[PDB]
Each structure stands twice: as structure tokens, then as C-alpha cells.
Amino acid sequence: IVDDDIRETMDEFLMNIRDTCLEGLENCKSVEEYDSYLDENGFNDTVELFENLLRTHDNFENEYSPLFSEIVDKAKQYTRDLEGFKEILLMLKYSLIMHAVELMAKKHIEIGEFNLLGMIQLIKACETCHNNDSILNLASLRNVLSRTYATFGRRIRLDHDLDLQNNLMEKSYDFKTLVLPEIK
Amino acid sequence: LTKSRSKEHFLSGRVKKALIQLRDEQSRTKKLEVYKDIANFLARHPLCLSEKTLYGRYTYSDINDYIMQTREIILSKISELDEVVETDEDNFLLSYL
Amino acid sequence: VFFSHWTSKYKERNPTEIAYSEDIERIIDSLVTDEITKEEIIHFLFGNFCFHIETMNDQHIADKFKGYQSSCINLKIEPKVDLADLKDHLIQKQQIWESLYGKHLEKIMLRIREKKKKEKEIPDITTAFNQNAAEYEEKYPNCFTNDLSETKTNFSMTWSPSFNNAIINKFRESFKSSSRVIYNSPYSTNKARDITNLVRLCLTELSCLTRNKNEFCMKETGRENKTIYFKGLAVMNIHMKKLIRHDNEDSLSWCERIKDSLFVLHNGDIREEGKITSVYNNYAKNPECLYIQDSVLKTELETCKKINKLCNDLAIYHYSEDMMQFSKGLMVADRYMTKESFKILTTANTSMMLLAFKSGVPYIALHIVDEDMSDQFNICYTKEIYSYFRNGSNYIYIMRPQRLNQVRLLSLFKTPSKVPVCFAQFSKKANEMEKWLKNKDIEKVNVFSMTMTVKQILINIVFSSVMIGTVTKLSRMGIFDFMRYAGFLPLSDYSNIKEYIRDKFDPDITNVADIYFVNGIKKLLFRMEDLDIIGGITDLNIKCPITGSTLLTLEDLYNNVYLAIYMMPKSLHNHVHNLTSLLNVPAEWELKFRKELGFNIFEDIYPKKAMFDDKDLFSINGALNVKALSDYYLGNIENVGLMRSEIENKEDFLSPCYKISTLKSSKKCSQSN
Amino acid sequence: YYRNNVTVLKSKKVSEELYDLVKQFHNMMEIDLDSVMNLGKGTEGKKHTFLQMLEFVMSKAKNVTGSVDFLVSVYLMSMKVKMMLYFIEHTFKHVAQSDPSEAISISGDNKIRALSTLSLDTITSYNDILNKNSKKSRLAFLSADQSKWSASDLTYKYVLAIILNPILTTGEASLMIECILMYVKLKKVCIPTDIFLNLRKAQGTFGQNETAIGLLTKGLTTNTYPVSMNWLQGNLNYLSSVYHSCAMKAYHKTLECYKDCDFQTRWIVHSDDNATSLIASGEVDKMLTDFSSSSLPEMLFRSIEAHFKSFCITLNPKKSYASSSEVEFISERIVNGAIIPLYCRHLANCCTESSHISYFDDLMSLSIHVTMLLRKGCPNEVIPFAYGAVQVQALSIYSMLPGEVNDSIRIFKKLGVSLKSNEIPTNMGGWLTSPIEPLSILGPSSNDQIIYYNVIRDFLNKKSLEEVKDSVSSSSYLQMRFRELKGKYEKGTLEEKDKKMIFLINLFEKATMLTQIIKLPNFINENALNKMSSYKDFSKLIASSLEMESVHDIMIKNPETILIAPLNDRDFLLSQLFMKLALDRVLRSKARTKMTYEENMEKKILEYCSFKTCVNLVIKDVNFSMLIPILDSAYPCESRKRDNYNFRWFQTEKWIPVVEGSPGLVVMHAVYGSNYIENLGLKNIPLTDDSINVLTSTFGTGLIMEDVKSLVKGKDSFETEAFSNSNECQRLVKACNYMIAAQNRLLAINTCFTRKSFPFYSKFNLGRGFISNTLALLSTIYSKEKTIRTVVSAQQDMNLEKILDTAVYISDKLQSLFPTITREDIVLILQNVCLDSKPIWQSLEDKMKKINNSTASGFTVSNVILSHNSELNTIQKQIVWMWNMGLCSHRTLDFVIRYIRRIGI
User: Fold this and answer.
1) Residue D334: beta bridge partners?
2) Which phi-psi region, left, alpha or beta, contains residue C76 (left: φ > 0; alpha: ψ -120 to 50)?
3) Which DSSP string corresponds to D436-474?
4) What is the CA radius of gyration of chain C?
5) Inter-chain CB proximity B1 and A137 less than 8 Å
6) Nearest chain B Cα to D783, which residue?
7) DSSP assignment string, C24-83
8) CB-defined contacts A:D, below 8 A
9) Rounded to an integer, what distance in angstroms lies between the CA atom of residue C356 and that of residue C349?
10) Backbone phi and psi for residue C364, each to the nearest 5 degrees, phi listed first
11) Cβ contacts from B onto C, under 8 A
12) CB neighbours (10 Å) of residue C182?
């Protein structure tokens, strides 16, 4: 790898990993303060950084991505065997003292006459428009009506009236200020 | 979203059925009557689209072009059907607009 | 830093005057203007490197400094060894050298104002065509005219109407009769009689023995048989050089007459199985088996079914297989057979027959026609039918010969890939065809119950599919690259509206029914030159091949005209004519370069004549491009050491030459031995 | 013979030319073994670099010999001129790489559309920000092509350039200057001999004169003709483009010399191409009267034409066209910020050309074209006709159409093979019967992997591949299935499933991943091996027995030669030393030329290591393993799936289950351009390395004694390779490769010292058994609007801190926009709203069940802080939120709030 600051950064991270791991596996006669020091900088602080650097590198997706996969997959195996060896060390210490992806679909949720698919999208567009102080687009109001989406697909009808005036709205704390700085 | 009801919910299907019947209508006067009714309805209901309106990638000018094309087609059909010989139609639309 | 290596042994060499050529000093001579002499431009040229000192090691800048002093000493220039005087000299030199864009700016508006005159414009496209036709008229006489009856075959090169040894047995039991001759306009010294004599001779008595099961030679007949045989051979020569103009009348009316006649010729085949049909409906009669989620979509699979059945009604796969057998029979007919032999070609159909008629590249097609669809078949191929005759309830026709080429055989072999996919694409593009296929269902589609508008657009799509899929003539190439070079019109002023027609157009039109294309694109261009402000909608124009009103998006027209462009093979003439063109383009270019620069065919290159000063033909500004390169290398390469190490590491010159894959793979060297 | 030396050219092998020049540098005029085994011992041996080779050949050809090196045809170049052109282009290509607005250093295809679209959107953004409160504003673009870039350009402009580069030193700048000036004073083009004879005969008998191309010759007395300023096209696509961009910025800096107007002109330069713009503000009227034009594109065209004419660039008016909305780079003209798809080129190349070597590889190339046309926004009904079109061209061109000879289904039916129609492999003449999704996402390995997966699922008697994973990964289960297979085979009670499985294992036995099996050669190289001099050197230095045992003995002396790629000397030349056609074979196919035709096709059908390796390459594939489960449980529509229907399902279900299964994208409708993500070509190269060592070992043991099943205890190399080849050697080396980790350090001295057998053919391929990658598919532009589970849990592990800011956000905001909502409804919508194709609640639940189980157990403080340190550090902010819906236990909450939220030497 060549990219200057990030090159030095993820060189530094894994040389720290390798040196700390060889120093943890250097000598061990005493009790588990060695592994207690090894755990947080062998498992937490650096592994998820390499997992992050795999999925956020953009200009290396065609030149260094199979390299980075072979780095971070071995890092995953290193994390798992760290957990196993640490459990073995704990067991000595206190004695001496698949289908989860296939839970998708059935995604047509409707509340009353309004679809609960375009509400989230329209309201995140509403927050985006208020954040940059811009006017809402008409097209974001297109996906509100259920009748356009009622011609195809199974319908889930959940009977809740559109009530917007009671107590449970008061515990949100999301930008109570009304900002209309172009309006008389 | 505003919990308000719009007037005359049952016009689009009736207008579509009337235009489908006008495709097969051999009557000269009924076409003029239906087109005059359409012209009166479009005059009585104004359009409130603003100049800042943007729909997707279509600006207000594109929707105004569609409105102008529809009004041009309707007025061309009216002028083709109604034959009143040159009664100075260039001075009434300018005063009305 | 980074341990910079010296990747050469030329450390003591100098770019100035130690090299072989003596060209640098005449570059300096050509580059001195007013108020700039030899010494100052030499100093700037070989001391502007000092903008990059902070990002280099000390030995490299020492090498540059000693090269600088050696270059100054060797060129009889007083050197500057100090740094303060060098910096002062270079800052007044950047001051005088940055005072040069004004002169070039004045010179380029001077060149634009002299380019503004001496040019002329055309009012409209039609006047551009008339003026181009006028130029071609005084270029060469004996062309244009209004005579349409003198032209060649219009519907490309092949014929195949709707209706092994049993077929030719049927043919030989039908040819025992006499003959008539019917033409367009009265001819003289009628050669159709000789062709009728030729087919009479070659089929009556000499078809009983066959060499290699499809061809046969002739050696022993009487002298009159050889006489009429050689007479038919003497018929085999037709040459023409005319042109049908862009403003001709009633050839268009002829074109829709032949289009309607060919469509009513189409729906007459009675076959239901074949070669191409099996693979296409095994992919297409059950098209859900190529998918996974069938139940999500139900308005697209049966439309493909409907298109497949409609093509089965029009025998498009049957015609594609017929042209396939035609093409492969002519490919094998080009073989070691002599000049007194010829061959028969029989397709999978029951009444289509061919005669090879010598090796060459010619042939003759034969036809068998019933009595119900009779006179419009005389309408169809009337320019290339020689004769026809009656036997019982049969009409038998003799057709005009022409010539072949192997790339034309390739273009015919591609036909089962040519016609169905383009037919499907244009049928997708036509929205009224889409709503007609949407209204009808799969067991209620037929050809005899269409709307007349649907009828006419289906005539147009059948004609365009056949014509695109059977491209064989040079005029098709000409109209195709004219369509591609005139596809730049439909946006704002691009300064090529008519000048390409005025200068770079090549007027070459051979036979009729391409007038439909040229006035379709003329209508399209006159629709596009109608006033456009900012933007608009698409539907107000018309397709080129399939008319197709109420267009969806301009993407559709870009796609379908570029289908009509991109499916043309390159050289339909020879490999040695485009080969010789690729050699002669640099030959003529270098000859006129040599003529403009005053060199001859015997002298050396003579690198600078000091002519290289803002002339239009072959020159530079001299002092400008050197400054542009100087500040480009200033503004591009920053931190020279690290990217220097990147150059030495990625492209790895410190490794041997075979480590690079691009200099070891099969590129073929062409060494001289 | 006209007192000259006429000589035609001959195209040799590039590797052979490098071998010859590397020889003749080392005074190696005659082939001899002892002149190269004497030196070059390991990494301390003799070495040569590129530039000393370059200057050596340059000093060799500095001697006058008729300038035979400077004799080139079009689209062709000699060896030394390839070296100097390589030197210029490959020393300057990183300089071209350093320019952000230039596109000769493209990443193949995607960088073109990406950079053109970003140029367009930044230009339009600059127009939009200059539209506010300005006096006057006008903008236009330019897509320009030059007339004859190869022959109009003066090469001497380069001579003024090379001396200005600070990247070189004094001496290599002179090197490039001298090679350029040698390129211009000796250039000549050899006319082809056949057209020379044709034109000479035509002049002799008919013309007695010639056209312009004959006046260079002195009455056609010379074969070759010189061109001076024409560097041929395709040779310098890098340097010329960058200096053309130098002319572009010369235009820019020329236009800031104007006083009353401001200009900001950016550019994209490809070879033979432009895409630029110009922005003018202020008094436009006096500016356009100064340049004598009425429109800004007119002024831009005239200025650009005059500037290009000033520096030997001829612009062509018929092809360069400039408007206010179009840019045509090579194709896909983008209008008003929206790209036209332009699948006309893809569907045209679907039926206009092919590579024309074999049936299978032409089918592969056209299938790649199918993937391109499907990936570029295909229209509605043309997919099955495109399938049929590529199939009928694959059938009609080489391997004949069904119903006649050379059929695939007919041969299988006349043999009575139990296989059904829609599972015949594509090498066996099987048609492209794969569905849309596996061909679309993978390409070459779609249909074969699908049929292999289905038959392993059938014989293994499971229901899904997730069952297959933990069923196979447990050892000795495959052994008991294979032994019950042997019991069923000796008994004779086999069924049709066993017959299909034995046919597919013996099919893969005689195969690569997918080879051709039937491989008719060309004109055999035995009459053309004399063209290569390496074959001459291989055959220059009873007797056959001693000579082959001697040469195999000298491979055994240094086994590292044949197996590693050439690293130094004494391991390169020894390694290289010791290692219209459609019209032809439409006649050559239906023939008995190689003594068999379409009976060799059926005689291959007539007749556990392969089993476990094939089920392993089924299960060790990464993207196929996540490809199948999103197919078999997929919803039809909605949740940004079906908003329209006009060819709209043809983009969304093609990739939204696939691409959003990965992160980095939220869009629905966009033409995508993928990487080379599917790498099935990393399992095959260790197997081939084992194939060479098995071949070498088999030759060695078979030529030291006969009928070898075990050795007679010779040396340890023979003994350890007897351990290698006792069972299947590929299987044992890959199996022992999962727990040996040598990676010896490539010093060629400790490599032979450490272990002479296993790291030789296990660690000298720079590759072993590892795991591939899945990318984010690189969405190029928006159109007109057991090993699985660990890495996936790691995806949620690194995504945990993001979804702790996302799920809490959306839960709070849905509680904000519905105040009558209940906790069961929160559970329901959190069970249904998914991110990165992962439902939120079950993804949190699988992580938090183990930490609640670890907390509720009897472990002490140190056994709980070190178990889930990352988890507790992530849940510091929203532990109460996890306790709110009854998820987190009160013991875990108490633990979090108490321990987290606070003589001798």
C-alpha cells in the first residue's frame, strides 16, 4: 500500500497488534493480569478498525481489496481464537484461585390509510430539508397514499387512527423550534 | 396529511368514459357540448402551481408546457368543431388574461 | 530521503551538445523574439528547474547544478554559480516570460478575425442538397436525370417467396412449357430470352447425374448447346453509373406500392417447424424457465410469446433459415470447381431453387407462384424479373443475376441474429404496437384482423427488419454513415449543420427505396431544426425505420438509429482497398507536409528552418509552448521524491525487464531477419 | 537488388526476443550449459535492471547498420522501438496519473462515466452558483475530435518538453531526448510485398506512371517509404494526451490575459478526444463582437480551432460538435445531468462479432456481452431473444445447430444418459440455461455452480446449503457417505441419483474449473517449433533414456526452478527453456481429420478427492454462498422495490437484494459497473502448482525405477514425495495447508535448507487456501429515476456502533410520529425494517443473548469485563434503551451502571 497517512496509520495499527501479541505470548508464569492487559488492545481497539478500513476504502476497491480481505479475515479468525484461548485462561485462573440473514421479506407495513414505508423516507427528507433550510419536494409526498401501492402485493391492514395529539410525543426532544425565515 | 377532504372525488372516471364515448360518438353537437363543459370546468378550477415547484427532474416550466399543450389541444378541437366565422377572438383572450 | 538510487551510468553526461544532434541551438535561434536574446532564453530554459529544490536530495540538485554550469560553459554562455544572482535573474525572467500571453491573445483574435471572413453559409438543408448536387453536376456530367427505369435491383440481392429431390422433380415436371417476357419500360436487344434459353438448357436434359450430390460439370453436348451456353455467359455483365436525386417524385409512391405488395407476399407460408424455430421457442415458448421469480411479473412473458407467434406467422425464422442455407451453400460453392460446372442450392422450403452459373460470384433464383397472389408479385421484383410463364395453376419466374462477396455471405449468415432482435426492439419501441399487443391475447392474435394503421406500421417494420438484416450494397453504407454524421443536429448550434453537407458529402445513390430513408431523415431534421428553447418533449417527431409516432424518450431514437448504424461490417469491397487507403493517408499527408515545408524526397529531415513561428500549416509559437510545459511540470509534479520512488517501485526498473508482463506476452516483435 | 539491402519482416515471440537480448548482453553467443550454471547462486547471484538493458541495446544500435530497428508497419513496432516507447510512456504514465482531470489512466470502464458525470455536475454547480446576483452568464461545452492526430502533430514539440522535466537527471533526460531524435530521422514504413507486386505489375503493363505514393520511390525502386512527423496512432496515447491538456491550460492562461471578462476552463482529455467547458461573466456583447461571433459555442469553436491550428493540431469540423447539453466522450452522451444508457453498442456486439477460436470461449465472450447488456439498463422483451441470439450464434458458427450432426441433447439421448435437459453442463454443449441473477452477478461460473450445487444437495439428501456447511465441515461424514457409496456400488443396487453423481464426479475429474475437454488443436506447433530458437537450444546440447533421466536429474538438482516464477538469473532462461478462421472450420468441423468427430464427444460420456474438493469449492465460494439465500426467500414488491413497471423490475430485483446485502448504497434505480469481484481463479493456481510437482515427481520416480507404488528408501526428497503421492497429492497438500504456515522468505538458500518438499510446492505460489472478497459493486451512475456466519457476525460487530446510532434514532422518531404506538408494534416494525439486508431486532438479539447468559451466570467481575468489553463500551449510551423494551436483564443493567458508568531480581 502507498497512500501516505492512511498507509502509515494501518501500518502502525498492525505492527502494534503483532508486537503486543508477541509480547503477550512472550512469557507467562504469573496470573491473568497479562491476558487482562492483552484483551482490550488485541480484541477491541484494533480489530474493528481493520473491519472499518475494509468497508470504507474506496480507491482501493479495484487494486487492494483482495489484499484487505485476506488481512481482515485472518483478523476475524485471530479474534475468535483470542476469545477461545482467553476462556481457557479464565478456566485455569478461577480454578487455581446461518438463517439469521433469512428473516427478511413481509415488508409491507401499513398503518391506517398511510404506508409505513414512505413515512420514514418522507420524514428523513423532512429533517434533511429543515437541516439545510430548504423547501420540501412534492415527490416526497408521492409515496404517502396506499392506493398507488394497493394494485400489487399483499396488504397488511393495521387499524390505528392518525392521532397526533397526546402525551407520548412529548418525550422525543427533536428540534422543537419552528424555523420559517422566509415567511410573513 | 392535513386531514382535509377534496371536492368532487368522482370526476376522472366519468371524464374518461365520456372521452371514450366521444371516440365512438358520431354526433356533432354532443362533442361541442362536452368540450364546452370541459372548458367551463377548466376555467372554473384554477391551477396554483408555483414557479419554485420542482417535481423530481421536472421543473414548473415542464408542467406548464404540459398544461399549455392540453389547453392548445382542447382549444384546437373546439375551434375545429365550432365554426363561427372570424369574430375577433384575438381581443378577448388578452383582456381575460 | 527514501534512499534515492542512481538508475543510470550517465551521471557525467549533459543534455546540451554532448548528445548527437545539433538541434537545440536552432531551437534557441527560432525561440528568440524581440527583447529576448540567446543567453536569457538559455538561462530560463535550463535553469527553471529551481522551482523544485525543497523536495529533492542534495546529490540530485548537485547533479542538476553541475549540468547547469556545464551547459552554460559549453554553449559559450557566462554561467551563474551563485544563488542570489541566479534567483534575481530567474525572477526578472519569470517577469518577462509571464509578459507573453498578451501577444498570443492578440494573435489569436487576429487569427479568429481572419477566419471570420472567406466563409459562406447555406440557408436550409434542402438548399444544401441542391447546391451539393450542383457541385457534383459540374464535377462529372452524365448523371442525375429523372429516368427511374434504368436502375438495378432495389431489394438488395436475394429473393424468397412463401408457398430434397422431390422439389427439383416438381420443378422439372413444371418447366415443360414455353415462356413470356414482361418488363417495366421497352428495352432493346432483349437478353431475357438468352437467360430463359440458359435455364431451359441447363434444366431440361442435363439434370440426371450429379458430382458430390449437389453440383455438376458439363463437357459433352452439341455445338448449339455450347453456343447458347456461352451466350448466357456473355449476358453476365451489367454496369451503371447514374444517381437518383433527393427531390424525385413518385418513386416514394412506388416504394409504398412495393412495401404493401411484399407484405401481402409475406403471409403465405404453411410450415410450422424448422431449425431456428426450435431453439428460439425452446428459449421462448416457455420463457419463465429462464427466470426465478415468475409470479412477480405477468405482463412481459406472454408479450414475448406473442412476438414469437407473430414472427411464426410471418415466417421470419423460416426466412432466416432459408437465407442461412442460401449463405452456406454459396460459401461451399466457392471451391475448386472449374469454369464449366455449376451447382444447385435447395433450402428447407419446397419450391425455392437456385442455379450457381459458373464459379465467379453469381447465381440465379427461381420461384413457384400460385394464382391467388399473382400480380402484386409482378409488382414486387419488377426491376429484376426477366421473364415468367404459366403452367397449369403455376407461374414460374426468372430473376436478374448479380454478384457476391464473402463478407456479404457473412452478413447473410448473421440473419437469424439480425432480424429477430431488431424486430423485437422496434416492436418494443412502437407504442401503438404495444397497446395493440396489450389489448389482444395469445389465442386471439392473427394477421387478417389488424387495424390499417397497425397494418401499415407492420409493413414498415417488416421492411426495415429485412433491409437492415440484409445489407449488401454500398449505398446502405453511405446512408448509414450520413445518418451517424448527421445525428449531431438535434441540439444547439454545433457549427456542422450544413458544412458537412457542403464539403464532406459524397453523393452516391444506386437503386430505389432508399429515398424513403433519406426523406424520413429529412423530415426528422426539419422537425429538429424547428425552434428549441432550453428543452422540450419527445413525442412530436417520427422514427427513422418504423415511423412510430408519439415517441417515449429520445433514448429510443438514439438506440434504434444506432442499431441501424452499428450493424454494418467494415469493408464490403476488398481487404486491399482499405489496406492501401491506410498506407496512402500518411503518404499523401506527409507529401503535402513536405511540399509546404519546402523539403524534397532526397534530403534529410532538417529539423528547423525557422519557419516554426505561428504559421497556420505547420508551426508553433516557439516561446509559448515551452512556458506552458514549464508551468505544467510546476503545477503537476509536487513532492518529486515520493512520486519518483513510486515510479521506480510500481513500474520497477530495478527489477529485470521480464518482470513486466506487458513486454513478455504475445505481441509479436517483427524483427528484421 | 539496387545496391541496397531489401529485407522483409518476420514476427517472432516477444519472450524469445527478451531471452535473446538477455543472452547477448552476457557475451552468450553460443548455447552452453556451463556458462550459466557457473554464476547466479540464489538472491546473491547476478542481476540486471531495465535501464542498463535499454542503454546497452541503444549503444548496440547506435552503430550504423541501415536502421533496421526503425522499420515499422502500422499497428506494429519492433523490439527496440517498443523498448523506447515503453520507456517514455511508462516513465510518464505516473505523471499522467498525477493529473486529476485526465482520463488515460482510467480504471478500465467505470472511471470514464464517473469522471465525465462529475465534470458535468461540478460545471453545472458552478453555473448555478454564478447564477445568483450576477450581471450576465453563459456556459457551453465541447466534445472535440481531431482530424489526424497521428500525422499532423509535430514531434519536435516533445523535444522542447523532455528537457523541462524535474523527474529525471542530466543523462536520462538526454537518454529520452536522444531516443526521440533517433525516432524522427530514421523512420520508414515497409509496404506489404503482395500489394507492392500488384502495383508494380499494374505500373509496368498498364500505367507507366503512379499516384502520390509512388513518387516517394524513385520509380518504384525501393520497398520502403519514409514518414517523418507521423508517430503511428496507439503508440503514444499518454504523452500526447497530457501535452494536449497542456495546450488546454495554455488556452486557460491565455484567457486570463483578457481584461474585462473572467474565465474558468476545465478539461478532460482522452487520446483523440476532448471534453471541456468555458464560463464567461460580464459584458458578453463586446466580447463576442471582439471575437466576431454571435453565440458562445461559435466563439469557443473558432478559438479552439485557431489555437489547435497554432500548435500542429488539426481539428475536424465534421465530427467535433459543441452544444449546451451534450458531451460525447466515446459514447453515452449525457444530457442535462442524465446519462443515456445506450445499449445499442452492447446489443449490436451481441450479433456482429466474436473472438472466433472455439465454441466455448466464444460463448463465454458473448455471455460477458450478455451481462453487459443486462447490466446497462436492458429493455423489456429482448432478454430471451438475446439469450436465443447468443445461443444460435454459438450453435451456427462452430458447433452445429440441433436436429443434425454435432448435437448435445441428441448424443445424450442416444447414449441414454439419465440427466435431464436443463442441467447439461455448458462444456457438454449445454445451452445457456442459467437464470438472470446468477449470470448477472457472477458471469462465467453461474450455471455450472448451480447444477453442481443442486446435485450435491440431491445426493447429500439435505434441503439447503446451510445444512451442507456444518454437515460437511464435520470430519468423517464424507468418508461414511463415500463408503456407503462403495457398498452400494459393489452390491449393484445403484439408482439414478448415484449415476448422475458418478457422471458428474468423473466429468470434473477430467477437468479444470471448466475446461473444454474436446480440444482440437490448430496446425500443430511441431512444424512451427523450429521458428522458436528456444526449442533449438532445448535440442542442441538408449541415448534418449540417458538424456531424459539426465535432464530430469538436473531439474531434481534445483527443484525450485520450474515451480517459482523467475526471481533472478539462472532461474529465468532455464525456466523458459525447460517449460476468417470461422470460414475454415465450418468446413473443418464436419470431417474425420483428427480420426474422430462427434464420436469423441460420446466416448467421453461412455466412461473422493474430486468429491471433497468439488463440494469444498462449492462451499468455499463466498459470493455464491450469500447469493442463494436471498433468492430463495425473496419478496415480490414494495419497500422501494416496485414504484413503476416500465422495464422497472429489470433493475431493482437484479441488484437490490444483492448490492444492499452489502453496504454503501441506498438508491433503487442505477446502472452499475462492477469490479472483478468473483475470483474463482485463486483455487486453481495452487492445484496447477501441485500438478507440475506431481508431474516432475512422477517422471523422476518412474525414471529411477519401474512400477512404483512406494520408494526403496532413497533420499529424503524421494521419501517425502512418496508421502506426497501415496494418496491424492493435491488433496493432502491442501489439507495439511490448513494448519501449516511456513511462508519461507524467498532467499533461495534457506528455502532448500528448511524443508525440501512441502514448502516447495505449497508456499512457492504466493497463494494457498483462503477466502475471497465481496465488494460494494461500485454503483457508477444513477439512471433516469461455518465461515459465512463468523464474518457476518463480524459485520454486525463493526456495524454495532452505527446501528446503535441508527436503530435508536428510528425508534425515537417513529415514537415521535406515532404517539399511540405500543411496544408490540415497536417489536413488529423493528422486526420488519432492515438495514444491509439484516433485520435489526434479531441482529441485536443474537449478540445480546450471550451477554445476558454470561452475566446471569456465576462468573465474577474479571470474567465478565473481559468477555464483552467491546459490547459494553458500545452500549454505554443506550443501556436504558435496551432495558426499556424488556430486552436487557436487570442484573446486566446493574453490572453496567455499577462497573462501567462510573536475594534476587
Assistant:
1) D339
2) left
3) HHHHHHTSTTSHHHHHHHHHHHHHTT-SSHHHHHHHHHS
4) 36
5) no
6) B57
7) HHHHHHHH--TT--HHHHHHHHTTGGGGS-TTS-HHHHHHHHHHHHHHHHHTT-----SS
8) 154
9) 18
10) -135, 130
11) 5
12) 11
To one decimal, the resolution in angstroms is 4.0
Residues in B closer than 8 angstroms to A162, CB to CB, are 3
In order of D74, D81, D158, D879, the CA distances from D227 in angstroms are 12, 15, 17, 80
- Report the chain D residue with the minimal C-alpha distance to residue C289: D435
Residue A124's φ and ψ, nearest 5 degrees, are -70, -30
CB atoms within 10 A of CB D70: 18
In angstroms, rounded to a whole number, what is the distance separating the alpha carbons of residues D671 and D652? 10
- CB B65 to CB C534 under 8 A? no
Say yes or no for a CB contact (<8 Å) between B53 and A141: no
Which residues of chain B make contact with C553, given a CB cutoff of 8 A?
Answer: none
Residues of A within 8 A of D839 (CB-CB) are 103-104
- Give the ranges where D530-633 is alpha helix by DSSP (H): 533-538, 543-557, 560-563, 573-577, 581-588, 600-606, 609-619, 623-632
Nearest to A139 among B1, B52, B55 (CB): B55
Nearest chain A residue to D631 by CA: give it.
A102
Q: Which residues pair with D268 in a beta bridge?
A: D275
Crossing angle between the packed helical segments C474-485 and C554-566, to the nearest 10 degrees: 150
Least CB-CB distance to D53: which of C12, C587, C657? C657
On chain D, the residues whose CB falls within 8 A of the CB of B56 are: 785
Contact assignment for D583 to C10 by CB distance below 8 Å? no
Q: Which of D343, D134, D149, D341 is nearest to D235 (CA)?
A: D149
* C368: β partners: C396
Q: Tell me how close the Cα of D138 comes to any Cα of chain C, in angstroms.
A: 13
- Measured from the Cβ of residue D108, the count of other Cβ atoms closer than 10 Å reads 10
With CA atoms as reference, report the closest residue to C623 among C126, C98, C19. Answer: C98
Q: Does B1 touch chain D (CB under 8 A)?
A: no
Report CB contact under 8 Å: B56, A139: yes
The DSSP bridge pattern shows strands C671-672 and D9-10 to be antiparallel
Residue C104 to chain D, least CA–CA distance (Å): 7
Burial degree of C209 (CB within 10 A; 0-12, 13-18, 19+)? exposed
Q: Measure the CA dihedral A8/A9/A12/A17, to 10°.
A: -150
User: Which three three-digit cell numbers place residue C318?
Assistant: 423460416
State the Cα–Cα distance between residues D153 and D246, nearest whole angstrom.
14
Residue of B nearest to C534 (CA): B61
Q: What are phi and psi of C12, to 5 degrees?
A: -90, -5
Tell me which method was used to determine the 3D structure: cryo-EM
Question: Alpha-carbon distance C313 to C263, whole Å?
Answer: 12
CA A7 to chain centre: 24
Chain D nearest C-alpha distance from C300 (Å)? 7
**Chain B residue nearest residue D337, CA to CA:** B57
Distance from CA of D473 to the nearest CA of C (A): 30
DSSP state of C247: T
Q: Pick from C566, C521, C513: which is nearest to C547 by CA?
A: C521
Q: How many Cβ atoms sit within 10 Å of the Cβ of residue A169?
A: 16
Burial (CB < 10 A; 0-12, 13-18, 19+), residue C661, is exposed
> What is the count of residue pairs from C and D with beta carbons less than 8 Å apart?
464
Question: Could you tell me the three cell numbers for D26?
Answer: 552476457
Q: Which amino acid is at D299?
A: M
Q: How far apart are CA D854 and CA D842, in angstroms?
A: 19
Q: Is B62 part of the contact surface with chain C (CB cutoff 8 Å)?
A: yes
Q: Which three cell numbers stand for residue D572?
A: 529465468
Q: Which of D269, D277, D280, D278 is nearest to D313 (CA)?
A: D269
